[PDB]
Write a protein that holds these residues in place. Structure first.
Motif, PDB file in Angstrom:
ATOM      1  N   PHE A  19       0.836  -1.193   0.000  1.00 28.89           N
ATOM      2  CA  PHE A  19       0.000   0.000   0.000  1.00 28.89           C
ATOM      3  C   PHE A  19       0.873   1.246   0.000  1.00 28.89           C
ATOM      4  O   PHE A  19       1.842   1.334   0.761  1.00 28.89           O
ATOM      5  N   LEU A  20       0.529   2.201  -0.862  1.00 34.94           N
ATOM      6  CA  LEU A  20       1.246   3.464  -0.958  1.00 34.94           C
ATOM      7  C   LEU A  20       1.161   4.232   0.355  1.00 34.94           C
ATOM      8  O   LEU A  20       0.074   4.652   0.763  1.00 34.94           O
ATOM      9  N   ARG A  21       2.292   4.415   1.023  1.00 38.19           N
ATOM     10  CA  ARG A  21       2.358   5.134   2.285  1.00 38.19           C
ATOM     11  C   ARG A  21       3.106   6.450   2.095  1.00 38.19           C
ATOM     12  O   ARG A  21       3.579   6.775   1.002  1.00 38.19           O
ATOM     13  N   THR A  22       3.205   7.215   3.179  1.00 38.90           N
ATOM     14  CA  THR A  22       3.861   8.510   3.129  1.00 38.90           C
ATOM     15  C   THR A  22       5.377   8.356   3.235  1.00 38.90           C
ATOM     16  O   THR A  22       5.903   7.291   3.571  1.00 38.90           O
ATOM     17  N   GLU A  27       5.119  14.101   0.453  1.00 36.46           N
ATOM     18  CA  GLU A  27       5.279  14.631   1.802  1.00 36.46           C
ATOM     19  C   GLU A  27       4.296  13.982   2.768  1.00 36.46           C
ATOM     20  O   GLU A  27       4.698  13.329   3.738  1.00 36.46           O
ATOM     21  N   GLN A  28       3.000  14.146   2.517  1.00 35.34           N
ATOM     22  CA  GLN A  28       1.985  13.623   3.420  1.00 35.34           C
ATOM     23  C   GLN A  28       0.659  13.518   2.682  1.00 35.34           C
ATOM     24  O   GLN A  28       0.431  14.189   1.672  1.00 35.34           O
ATOM     25  N   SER A  29      -0.211  12.660   3.206  1.00 38.34           N
ATOM     26  CA  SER A  29      -1.576  12.507   2.723  1.00 38.34           C
ATOM     27  C   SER A  29      -2.533  12.964   3.814  1.00 38.34           C
ATOM     28  O   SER A  29      -2.411  12.537   4.967  1.00 38.34           O
ATOM     29  N   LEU A  30      -3.480  13.826   3.454  1.00 40.92           N
ATOM     30  CA  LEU A  30      -4.356  14.444   4.436  1.00 40.92           C
ATOM     31  C   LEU A  30      -5.784  14.477   3.911  1.00 40.92           C
ATOM     32  O   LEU A  30      -6.019  14.470   2.699  1.00 40.92           O
ATOM     33  N   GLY A  44       2.879  11.233  12.120  1.00 39.74           N
ATOM     34  CA  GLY A  44       3.681  11.784  11.044  1.00 39.74           C
ATOM     35  C   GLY A  44       3.600  10.980   9.762  1.00 39.74           C
ATOM     36  O   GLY A  44       3.512  11.541   8.670  1.00 39.74           O
ATOM     37  N   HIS A  45       3.628   9.658   9.896  1.00 42.66           N
ATOM     38  CA  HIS A  45       3.558   8.749   8.761  1.00 42.66           C
ATOM     39  C   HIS A  45       2.141   8.208   8.633  1.00 42.66           C
ATOM     40  O   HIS A  45       1.550   7.762   9.622  1.00 42.66           O
ATOM     41  N   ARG A  46       1.601   8.249   7.417  1.00 43.43           N
ATOM     42  CA  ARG A  46       0.240   7.812   7.148  1.00 43.43           C
ATOM     43  C   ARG A  46       0.241   6.829   5.984  1.00 43.43           C
ATOM     44  O   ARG A  46       1.266   6.588   5.341  1.00 43.43           O
ATOM     45  N   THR A  47      -0.931   6.255   5.725  1.00 47.04           N
ATOM     46  CA  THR A  47      -1.152   5.379   4.583  1.00 47.04           C
ATOM     47  C   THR A  47      -2.160   6.037   3.653  1.00 47.04           C
ATOM     48  O   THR A  47      -3.246   6.432   4.090  1.00 47.04           O
ATOM     49  N   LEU A  48      -1.797   6.157   2.378  1.00 42.02           N
ATOM     50  CA  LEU A  48      -2.666   6.818   1.414  1.00 42.02           C
ATOM     51  C   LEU A  48      -3.937   6.011   1.182  1.00 42.02           C
ATOM     52  O   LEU A  48      -3.946   4.778   1.255  1.00 42.02           O
ATOM     53  N   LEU A  49      -5.021   6.727   0.897  1.00 35.53           N
ATOM     54  CA  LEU A  49      -6.298   6.112   0.573  1.00 35.53           C
ATOM     55  C   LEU A  49      -7.095   7.077  -0.291  1.00 35.53           C
ATOM     56  O   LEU A  49      -6.834   8.283  -0.314  1.00 35.53           O
ATOM     57  N   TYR A  50      -8.071   6.527  -1.009  1.00 35.29           N
ATOM     58  CA  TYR A  50      -8.845   7.317  -1.957  1.00 35.29           C
ATOM     59  C   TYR A  50      -9.643   8.400  -1.242  1.00 35.29           C
ATOM     60  O   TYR A  50     -10.092   8.229  -0.105  1.00 35.29           O
ATOM     61  N   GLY A  51      -9.819   9.528  -1.927  1.00 30.63           N
ATOM     62  CA  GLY A  51     -10.510  10.657  -1.339  1.00 30.63           C
ATOM     63  C   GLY A  51      -9.650  11.524  -0.449  1.00 30.63           C
ATOM     64  O   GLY A  51     -10.171  12.161   0.472  1.00 30.63           O
ATOM     65  N   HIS A  52      -8.344  11.569  -0.698  1.00 28.23           N
ATOM     66  CA  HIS A  52      -7.417  12.336   0.118  1.00 28.23           C
ATOM     67  C   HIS A  52      -6.465  13.115  -0.779  1.00 28.23           C
ATOM     68  O   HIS A  52      -6.214  12.744  -1.928  1.00 28.23           O
ATOM     69  N   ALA A  53      -5.934  14.205  -0.233  1.00 29.07           N
ATOM     70  CA  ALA A  53      -5.015  15.077  -0.947  1.00 29.07           C
ATOM     71  C   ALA A  53      -3.586  14.841  -0.474  1.00 29.07           C
ATOM     72  O   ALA A  53      -3.348  14.571   0.706  1.00 29.07           O
ATOM     73  N   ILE A  54      -2.639  14.949  -1.407  1.00 32.70           N
ATOM     74  CA  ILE A  54      -1.224  14.764  -1.125  1.00 32.70           C
ATOM     75  C   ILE A  54      -0.443  15.958  -1.647  1.00 32.70           C
ATOM     76  O   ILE A  54      -0.913  16.735  -2.485  1.00 32.70           O
ATOM     77  N   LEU A  55       0.778  16.082  -1.134  1.00 36.20           N
ATOM     78  CA  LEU A  55       1.761  17.053  -1.584  1.00 36.20           C
ATOM     79  C   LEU A  55       2.954  16.301  -2.153  1.00 36.20           C
ATOM     80  O   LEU A  55       3.446  15.353  -1.534  1.00 36.20           O
ATOM     81  N   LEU A  56       3.409  16.713  -3.332  1.00 33.98           N
ATOM     82  CA  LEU A  56       4.545  16.091  -3.996  1.00 33.98           C
ATOM     83  C   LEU A  56       5.695  17.085  -4.075  1.00 33.98           C
ATOM     84  O   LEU A  56       5.491  18.252  -4.419  1.00 33.98           O
ATOM     85  N   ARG A  57       6.903  16.622  -3.761  1.00 37.97           N
ATOM     86  CA  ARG A  57       8.086  17.472  -3.729  1.00 37.97           C
ATOM     87  C   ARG A  57       9.175  16.817  -4.565  1.00 37.97           C
ATOM     88  O   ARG A  57       9.569  15.681  -4.289  1.00 37.97           O
TER      89      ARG A  57
END
Lengths: 48, 48, 134, 48
Positions: free
Chosen positions: C3-6, C60-63, C75-88
């Motif tokens: 699973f895609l994590r942060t 960076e993070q999924s929120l 600090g560390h999360r697991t990505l899931l549908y319906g959420h926004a992320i930041l890419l660096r």
């Protein structure tokens, strides 16, 4: 749980929760209390 | 690209210096505006 | 099944499939001297090796949407549908964003995407949605 | 479109929630503009 988290995110900014929010929180928390009790009964008696 | 990376081990996509077996020289290229147009590889080390 | 994590690197791969060849490409952006992104062919690596130095984005993070709005108002999360992320971007260290410029005369509704120096504003955040019905 | 206008505008004031929902649906389905104002056609309204 996701709905309650969304409500918490909504009311986190405001200093004081209003009466409507308190009523909604009470409703959701009572429903969650029922669900927990149901799950508890499912496994309470040793059920592998 | 890299979901897992064991610390202390070499993984792809890493820029690194290949020091030769003498520990004072490394696998390098020509210095600057050379006659070979920086196309011959060497083991000069030292300042580089 | 992973699973895609942060706090991990990403390529953001896509398939062009022009001339029925199923080409695989990824976003590339140097970040210094040019903020605009472009597609680089990751296929045909045997003939020419594509460069992946400018094709790596650490997430960076999924929120959640509500928390994102809250912190935008403020600090560390697991990505899931319906959420926004930041890419660096890994190299330039700047955040990917949606630029207000439009280099494409073909589509007026199409803005541009590029790297911005700071994560201020919501133009850098991007929300995921499920592509498949499953 | 007349029905949507009645839904959005009441008493000379725009309903924020209904207006937001309507505009998001319209941008979600870009085929509601016909030849002009089209994502693919790109025909100018004056020319149309």
């Amino acid at each position: 749980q996701e709905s309650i988290s969304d409500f918490y995110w909504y009311y986190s900014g405001k200093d004081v929760i209003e009466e409507q929010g308190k009523r909604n929180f009470s409703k959701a928390m009572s429903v969650a209390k029922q669900v927990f009790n149901s799950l508890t009964e499912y496994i309470q008696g040793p059920c592998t | 690209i890299c979901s897992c990376c064991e610390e202390g081990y070499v993984t792809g996509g890493h820029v690194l210096r290949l020091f030769h077996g003498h520990m004072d020289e490394c696998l390098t290229i020509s210095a600057a505006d050379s006659d070979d147009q920086r196309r011959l590889v060497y083991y000069e080390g030292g300042a580089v | 099944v992973q699973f895609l994590r942060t706090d991990d690197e990403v390529v953001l791969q896509c398939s062009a499939t022009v001339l029925k060849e199923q080409l695989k490409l990824c976003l590339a952006a140097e970040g210094f001297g040019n903020r605009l992104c472009f597609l680089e062919p990751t296929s045909n690596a045997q003939n020419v090796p594509p460069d992946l130095a400018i094709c790596c984005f650490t997430l960076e993070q999924s929120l959640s949407v509500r928390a994102l709005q809250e912190m935008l108002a403020n600090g560390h999360r697991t990505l899931l549908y319906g959420h926004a992320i930041l890419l660096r971007h890994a190299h330039s260290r700047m955040y990917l964003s949606c630029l207000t410029t439009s280099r494409s005369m073909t589509d007026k509704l199409a803005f541009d995407v590029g790297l911005q120096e700071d994560a201020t504003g919501e133009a850098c955040w991007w929300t995921m949605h499920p592509a498949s019905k499953q | 479109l007349d029905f949507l206008r009645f839904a959005v505008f009441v008493n000379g004031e725009s309903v924020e929630e209904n207006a937001n929902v309507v505009v998001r649906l319209l941008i979600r389905k870009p085929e509601c503009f016909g030849p002009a104002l089209r994502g693919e056609g790109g025909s100018g309204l004056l020319a149309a």
